[PDB]
Coordinates of all heavy atoms in Angstrom, one line a residue:
Chain X
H700 N -0.7 -150.1 52.5 CA -1.4 -151.4 52.8 C -0.9 -152.5 52.0 O -1.0 -152.4 50.7 CB -2.9 -151.2 52.7 CG -3.7 -152.4 53.0 ND1 -3.5 -153.2 54.1 CD2 -4.8 -152.9 52.3 CE1 -4.4 -154.2 54.1 NE2 -5.2 -154.0 53.0
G701 N -0.4 -153.6 52.6 CA 0.1 -154.7 51.9 C 1.6 -154.9 52.0 O 2.1 -156.0 51.8
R702 N 2.3 -153.8 52.3 CA 3.8 -153.9 52.4 C 4.2 -154.6 53.7 O 3.7 -154.2 54.8 CB 4.4 -152.5 52.4 CG 5.9 -152.5 52.5 CD 6.6 -151.2 52.2 NE 8.1 -151.4 52.4 CZ 9.0 -150.4 52.1 NH1 8.6 -149.2 51.6 NH2 10.2 -150.7 52.4
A703 N 5.0 -155.6 53.5 CA 5.5 -156.4 54.7 C 6.7 -155.9 55.2 O 7.6 -155.5 54.5 CB 5.6 -157.9 54.2
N704 N 6.9 -155.9 56.6 CA 8.0 -155.3 57.2 C 8.7 -156.2 58.3 O 8.0 -156.7 59.2 CB 7.7 -154.0 57.9 CG 6.9 -153.1 56.9 OD1 5.7 -153.2 56.8 ND2 7.6 -152.2 56.2
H705 N 10.0 -156.3 58.2 CA 10.8 -157.1 59.2 C 10.7 -158.6 59.1 O 10.1 -159.3 59.9 CB 10.5 -156.7 60.6 CG 10.4 -155.2 60.8 ND1 9.9 -154.6 62.0 CD2 10.6 -154.2 60.0 CE1 9.9 -153.3 61.9 NE2 10.3 -153.0 60.7
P706 N 11.4 -159.2 58.1 CA 11.3 -160.6 57.9 C 12.2 -161.4 58.9 O 12.9 -160.8 59.8 CB 11.8 -160.8 56.5 CG 12.8 -159.7 56.4 CD 12.1 -158.6 57.0
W707 N 12.2 -162.7 58.8 CA 13.0 -163.6 59.6 C 12.8 -163.7 61.2 O 12.2 -164.6 61.6 CB 14.5 -163.3 59.4 CG 14.9 -163.8 58.1 CD1 15.0 -163.2 56.9 CD2 15.4 -165.2 57.9 NE1 15.5 -164.1 55.9 CE2 15.7 -165.3 56.5 CE3 15.5 -166.3 58.7 CZ2 16.1 -166.5 55.9 CZ3 15.9 -167.5 58.1 CH2 16.2 -167.6 56.8
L708 N 13.4 -162.7 61.9 CA 13.3 -162.8 63.4 C 12.0 -162.4 64.0 O 12.0 -161.5 64.8 CB 14.5 -162.1 64.0 CG 15.8 -162.6 63.4 CD1 17.0 -162.0 64.1 CD2 15.9 -164.1 63.4
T709 N 10.9 -163.1 63.7 CA 9.6 -162.8 64.3 C 9.0 -164.1 64.8 O 9.2 -165.1 64.2 CB 8.6 -162.2 63.2 OG1 7.3 -162.2 63.8 CG2 8.6 -163.0 61.9
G710 N 8.4 -164.0 66.0 CA 7.8 -165.2 66.6 C 6.6 -165.8 65.8 O 6.1 -166.8 66.1
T711 N 6.3 -165.1 64.7 CA 5.2 -165.5 63.8 C 5.6 -166.9 63.3 O 4.7 -167.8 63.1 CB 4.9 -164.6 62.7 OG1 4.7 -163.3 63.2 CG2 3.8 -165.1 61.8
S712 N 6.9 -167.1 63.0 CA 7.3 -168.3 62.4 C 7.1 -169.5 63.3 O 6.6 -170.5 62.8 CB 8.8 -168.2 62.0 OG 9.7 -167.8 63.0
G713 N 7.6 -169.4 64.5 CA 7.4 -170.5 65.4 C 6.0 -170.8 65.7 O 5.5 -172.0 65.7
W714 N 5.2 -169.8 65.8 CA 3.7 -170.0 66.1 C 3.0 -170.5 64.9 O 2.1 -171.3 65.1 CB 3.1 -168.6 66.5 CG 2.9 -168.6 68.0 CD1 3.5 -167.8 68.9 CD2 1.9 -169.4 68.7 NE1 3.1 -168.1 70.2 CE2 2.1 -169.0 70.1 CE3 0.9 -170.3 68.4 CZ2 1.3 -169.6 71.1 CZ3 0.2 -170.9 69.4 CH2 0.3 -170.6 70.7
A715 N 3.4 -170.1 63.7 CA 2.8 -170.6 62.5 C 3.1 -172.1 62.4 O 2.2 -172.9 62.1 CB 3.3 -169.9 61.3
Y716 N 4.3 -172.5 62.6 CA 4.7 -173.9 62.5 C 4.0 -174.7 63.6 O 3.5 -175.8 63.3 CB 6.2 -174.0 62.8 CG 6.8 -175.4 62.5 CD1 7.0 -175.8 61.2 CD2 7.0 -176.3 63.5 CE1 7.5 -177.1 60.9 CE2 7.4 -177.6 63.2 CZ 7.7 -178.0 61.9 OH 8.1 -179.2 61.6
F717 N 3.9 -174.2 64.8 CA 3.2 -174.9 65.9 C 1.8 -175.1 65.6 O 1.2 -176.1 65.8 CB 3.4 -174.1 67.2 CG 2.8 -174.7 68.4 CD1 3.2 -176.0 68.8 CD2 1.9 -174.0 69.2 CE1 2.6 -176.6 70.0 CE2 1.3 -174.6 70.3 CZ 1.7 -175.9 70.7
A718 N 1.1 -174.0 65.1 CA -0.3 -174.0 64.8 C -0.7 -175.0 63.7 O -1.6 -175.7 63.8 CB -0.7 -172.6 64.4
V719 N 0.1 -175.0 62.6 CA -0.2 -175.9 61.5 C 0.1 -177.4 61.9 O -0.8 -178.2 61.7 CB 0.6 -175.6 60.3 CG1 0.4 -176.6 59.1 CG2 0.3 -174.1 59.8
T720 N 1.2 -177.6 62.4 CA 1.6 -179.0 62.8 C 0.8 -179.6 63.9 O 0.4 -180.8 63.8 CB 3.1 -179.2 63.1 OG1 3.4 -178.3 64.3 CG2 4.0 -178.8 62.0
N721 N 0.5 -178.8 64.9 CA -0.3 -179.3 66.1 C -1.8 -179.2 66.1 O -2.5 -179.9 66.8 CB 0.3 -178.7 67.4 CG 1.6 -179.2 67.8 OD1 1.7 -179.7 69.0 ND2 2.6 -179.1 67.0
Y722 N -2.3 -178.2 65.3 CA -3.7 -178.0 65.3 C -4.5 -178.2 64.0 O -5.5 -178.8 63.9 CB -4.0 -176.6 65.9 CG -3.5 -176.5 67.3 CD1 -2.2 -176.0 67.6 CD2 -4.3 -176.9 68.3 CE1 -1.8 -176.0 68.9 CE2 -3.9 -176.9 69.7 CZ -2.6 -176.5 69.9 OH -2.1 -176.5 71.2
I723 N -3.9 -177.7 62.9 CA -4.6 -177.9 61.6 C -4.3 -179.4 61.2 O -5.3 -180.1 60.9 CB -4.0 -177.0 60.5 CG1 -4.5 -175.5 60.8 CG2 -4.4 -177.4 59.1 CD1 -4.0 -174.5 59.7
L724 N -3.1 -179.8 61.2 CA -2.8 -181.2 60.9 C -3.1 -182.0 62.2 O -3.2 -183.2 62.1 CB -1.3 -181.3 60.5 CG -0.9 -180.5 59.3 CD1 0.6 -180.7 58.9 CD2 -1.8 -180.8 58.1
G725 N -3.1 -181.3 63.3 CA -3.5 -181.9 64.6 C -2.6 -183.0 65.2 O -3.1 -183.8 65.9
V726 N -1.3 -182.9 64.9 CA -0.4 -183.9 65.5 C 0.3 -183.3 66.7 O 1.0 -182.4 66.7 CB 0.7 -184.3 64.5 CG1 1.6 -185.3 65.0 CG2 0.1 -184.8 63.2
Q727 N 0.0 -184.0 67.9 CA 0.5 -183.5 69.2 C 1.1 -184.6 70.0 O 0.5 -185.6 70.3 CB -0.6 -182.8 70.0 CG -1.2 -181.6 69.4 CD -2.3 -181.0 70.2 OE1 -2.3 -181.1 71.4 NE2 -3.2 -180.3 69.5
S728 N 2.4 -184.3 70.5 CA 3.0 -185.2 71.4 C 2.4 -185.0 72.7 O 2.0 -183.9 73.0 CB 4.5 -185.0 71.4 OG 4.8 -183.6 71.7
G729 N 2.4 -186.0 73.6 CA 1.9 -185.8 74.9 C 2.7 -186.6 75.9 O 3.7 -187.2 75.6
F730 N 2.3 -186.5 77.2 CA 3.0 -187.1 78.3 C 2.9 -188.7 78.2 O 3.9 -189.4 78.6 CB 2.5 -186.7 79.6 CG 2.8 -185.2 79.9 CD1 1.7 -184.3 80.2 CD2 4.1 -184.7 79.9 CE1 2.0 -183.0 80.5 CE2 4.3 -183.4 80.2 CZ 3.3 -182.5 80.5
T731 N 1.8 -189.2 77.7 CA 1.6 -190.6 77.6 C 1.4 -191.1 76.2 O 1.4 -192.4 76.0 CB 0.4 -191.0 78.5 OG1 -0.8 -190.4 78.0 CG2 0.6 -190.6 79.9
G732 N 1.2 -190.3 75.2 CA 1.0 -190.7 73.9 C 0.9 -189.6 72.8 O 0.9 -188.4 73.2

Side-chain angles (χ1 to χ4, degrees):
Chain X
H700 176 47
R702 179 168 178 175
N704 314 85
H705 314 174
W707 283 96
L708 310 187
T709 167
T711 302
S712 58
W714 257 108
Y716 190 79
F717 182 58
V719 177
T720 61
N721 284 239
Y722 298 93
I723 287 180
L724 302 181
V726 182
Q727 295 178 31
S728 53
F730 294 122
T731 63

